[PDB]
RNA sequence: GCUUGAGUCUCGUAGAGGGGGGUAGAAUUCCAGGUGUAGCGGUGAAAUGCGUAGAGAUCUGGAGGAAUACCGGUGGCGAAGGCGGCCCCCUGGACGAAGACUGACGCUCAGGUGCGAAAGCGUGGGGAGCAAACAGGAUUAGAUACCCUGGUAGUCCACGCCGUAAACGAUGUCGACUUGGAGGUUGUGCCCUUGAGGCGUGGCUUCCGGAGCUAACGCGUUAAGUCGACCGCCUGGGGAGUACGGCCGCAAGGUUAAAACUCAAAUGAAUUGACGGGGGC
C-alpha cells in the first residue's frame with residue numbers, strides 16, 4: 001500500500017467523521033437562545049431555498 | 053403481573069459458577085410463582101470496549117414474569133455479587149419466549 | 159415488529175464505523191422506527207454489544 | 213391509577229346496575245377513590261407539581277358533581293356523602 | 301540507545317502550535333520537537349511550514365533509534381495535521397497505520413465564553 | 418323530560434410530561450508513577466503566566482464534579498415557566514376505535530388560591546469546568562472596557578424564600594361558521610398478497626395563499642375574517658410604574674398607584690433619497 005493513498009483515505013475518513021467541525025463548534029460556549037436562533041435561521045433558509 | 057427481561061454479564065473466570073447462578077435466580081422467581089419464559093446462556097463473547105480492564109465476559113439472558121419484590125432482591129444480589137460486572141433489568145409489554153438472535157445465529 | 163437491541167446485525171446498518179448513529183435523512187427510516195433504533199443502539203452500547211466510539 | 217377490578221367493584225357498589233358507570237354517585241365514588249389513592253403518592257413526592265395539577269382537577273370535578281347532586285335532590289346527596297365520608 | 305523498529309508518532313496540532321513526538325509502542329516517549337522549538341517564535345509557529353520543520357527536527361532527534369515503521373496518530377484541529385504527516389514520509393519512515401484521535405467531550409464541560417472581537 | 422354540550426367506564430397508542438432512586442461512556446481538571454527535554458501558553462502584535470525543583474507532549478492508574486457527541490428534526494410532551502444518555506419505581510395529561518352509562522351536571526370570572534426562567538436571599542453540603550467582583554498584562558490620549566493570564570461569589574444538591582423577564586405568537590378564554598395548495602407527526606377503517614402499497618377518516622403541528630379584514634406591514638379554517646359569552650386592559654409625550662399610604666418580603670425589592678409641573682408633540686407603518694467600519698456583481 002502506497003503512503004499517499006493511505007493519506008487521502010485518512011483525510012476522507014476524517015472529513016466524513018466530522019470531528020474537526022465538532023471541535024471548532026465546541027471551542028467556545030454558545031448560549032441556548034443563540035443556538036436556537038441559529039437553528040431556526042438555518043431552517044428558514046433551507047425552506048425558502050428548497051422552495052426557490 | 054409484570055414481565056421483565058434480565059441480561060447480566062459475569063467475569064469469565066467465574067463462568068463455571070454461571071450454571072450455578074442461573075439456578076438460584078430461577079429458584080427465587082418460581083419461588084414467587086413466576087414463570088421463566090426464556091433462558092439463554094450464550095457466553096464467552098468479546099466485548100466492544102473493555103470493562104474493568106477485561107476484554108470478554110459471560111452473558112446470560114432471562115425473560116421472566118414476576119412481582120416487583122423478587123425483581124428488586126435479584127437486583128441487589130447482582131449489585132453485591134462481585135462476579136457480575138454488568139446487569140440490566142428491563143420491562144416488557146408481554147411474555148416473550150422465542151429464541152433470541154444471539155442463539156438463533158448459532 | 160419491535161426493533162430488538164440484542165439483534166446486533168441489523169443495528170450495525172444504522173451506525174457509522176466510528177459508532178455514531180446515522181441520521182434518518184440518510185437511511186430513509188420512519189421517525190418512529192428511528193426513535194426505536196436510537197433507543198436500541200444506546201441499550202446495546204450499555205451492554206458492550208456495540209462500541210460507543212472507535 | 214385504580215386497577216380495573218377496583219373500578220369495576222366501585223361501579224357495582226354505587227351504581228344501580230353493573231353497567232351504570234355514568235351516574236353521579238359512581239363518578240363521585242371513583243373520584244374519591246382516586247384522590248385517596250393519590251394521597252400517599254403526594255405524601256412521598258411533595259414537589260410533583262405536575263401530577264398535583266391532575267389531582268386538583270379531580271378535586272374540582274368532585275366538587276362540581278356534588279354540587280349538581282345536592283341541587284338535583286338532597287336525599288341521594290346526603291346518603292352518598294355519608295357513605296363516602298365527605299365533610300361537604 | 302536501543303533500537304525500536306515499530307514506533308508511534310503523536311501529532312498535537314493546536315490552532316497556535318504544532319508538537320510532534322515519536323514514542324515507542326508502549327507510550328514511552330523517545331523524541332519530540334515543536335514548531336516554536338524549531339526556531340519559529342510567535343504567530344509564525346502557527347504556519348504549516350513550521351510544522352514540516354518540526355517534523356524534520358523530530359526525525360533528526362530520533363535517528364539514533366532504529367525506527368523505520370511509524371504508526372501515526374494526530375490530535376487537534378490546527379494547521380499542522382497534513383503538512384507534518386507529509387514530512388515524515390520525506391524523512392523516510394515507513395508509515396504502517398495512521399489513525400485520528402481527537403477529544404470529543406460528548407457534552408461534558410462548559411467551554412470558555414465567546415471572544416467579542 | 419331529552420341527548421346533540423359536559424362528563425364516566427371498557428381497549429389501545431405515541432410522548433425530553435412530572436417526582437424518586439440507580440447506572441454508563443466521552444471529555445476537562447487534579448493527584449501518583451513511567452518515558453523524555455527546552456520550551457509551553459497566549460495575541461492583531463505582544464506581554465503577564467507556567468517550565469530544568471523537569472513543564473508542555475505521551476502512557477498507566479486513581480479521585481472528583483458537572484453535563485449528556487451522534488440520534489436530533491420547521492420533531493415530540495407540558496397550562497405556562499419549561500422538559501434531552503440508559504434502567505427501574507411512583508405518577509399526571511392527551512389522542513383514537515367501538516359500545517355502554519349520566520342527563521345541561523356548562524362557559525367565563527372581580528376578590529381568592531396555586532404554579533412560575535435566570536439572577537438574588539437564608540441554612541447546610543459540594544465545588545471539575547466556567548465565571549460577575551477583583552488582580553495583573555496589553556490597547557488607548559484616557560480604557561475605569563472590548564483582548565490576554567488568573568480568579569471569588571455564583572453556577573450543582575437539600576430544604577425554605579423571592580414572584581420578576583422582549584415570562585413573546587409583543588395576539589385572553591370558550592363556542593359556531595367561512596374557498597384552496599404543499600408538508601411534518603401520531604392514531605384508526607376498508608382494500609393490491611400483505612410487510613412495502615391504494616383509497617378514506619380523527620388529533621396536533623409548519624409554510625404559502627383566496628375572499629374578507631387592516632393605516633400599512635401583514636393575518637388569512639391554528640384569523641388579525643363573520644359572530645356570540647365573560648374577563649383583563651387603554652385614553653397625548655414626559656414627570657412615572659415614580660412619590661405617599663397599604664399589603665407582601667430576611668433583604669434586594671415586588672404589588673396597588675397619584676399630583677404639581679412642562680411641551681406640542683411623542684408615536685406606528687410605508688415612500689424617495691442619502692449614508693453604513695452591510696452584501697453582491
Ligand SMILES: NC(=O)OC[C@@H](O)C[C@H](NC(=O)[C@H]1NCCC[C@H]1O)C(=O)N[C@@H](Cc1c[nH]cn1)C(=O)N[C@H](C(=O)O)[C@H](O)c1c[nH]c(Cl)n1
Nearest residue numbers: 415416417460461462556557558559560562563564565694
Ligand atoms: N482607543 C482605544 O482604546 O484603542 C484604540 C482602538 O481603536 C483599537 C481597536 N480596538 C478594537 O478594535 C477592539 N475591538 C474588540 C476586541 C478588542 C479590541 O481590538 C483596534 O484597532 N484593534 C485592532 C488591534 C489593535 C491594533 N492596535 C491596537 N489594537 C484589531 O485587530 N481590531 C479588530 C477589528 O477592528 O476588526 C478586532 O476587533 C480584533 C481582532 N482581534 C482583536 Cl484582540 N480585536
Ligand SMILES: [K+]
Nearest residue numbers: 432434508509
Ligand atoms: K406516563
Ligand SMILES: [K+]
Nearest residue numbers: 418419519520
Ligand atoms: K335517561
Ligand SMILES: [K+]
Nearest residue numbers: 412547548567
Ligand atoms: K477564566
Ligand SMILES: [K+]
Nearest residue numbers: 556557558559
Ligand atoms: K484613540
Ligand SMILES: [K+]
Nearest residue numbers: 544568569570
Ligand atoms: K470559584
Ligand SMILES: [K+]
Nearest residue numbers: 537579580581
Ligand atoms: K426575585
Ligand SMILES: [K+]
Nearest residue numbers: 583585586587
Ligand atoms: K418568542
Ligand SMILES: [K+]
Nearest residue numbers: 602603619620
Ligand atoms: K394527519
Ligand SMILES: [K+]
Nearest residue numbers: 604605617618
Ligand atoms: K392515515
Ligand SMILES: [K+]
Nearest residue numbers: 633634686687
Ligand atoms: K402598501
Ligand SMILES: [K+]
Nearest residue numbers: 526589648649
Ligand atoms: K380574564
Ligand SMILES: [K+]
Nearest residue numbers: 653654655679
Ligand atoms: K400632561
Ligand SMILES: [K+]
Nearest residue numbers: 538667668669
Ligand atoms: K439578605
Ligand SMILES: [Mg+2]
Nearest residue numbers: 213246266270
Ligand atoms: Mg381520569
Ligand SMILES: [Mg+2]
Nearest residue numbers: 315316343346
Ligand atoms: Mg493563533
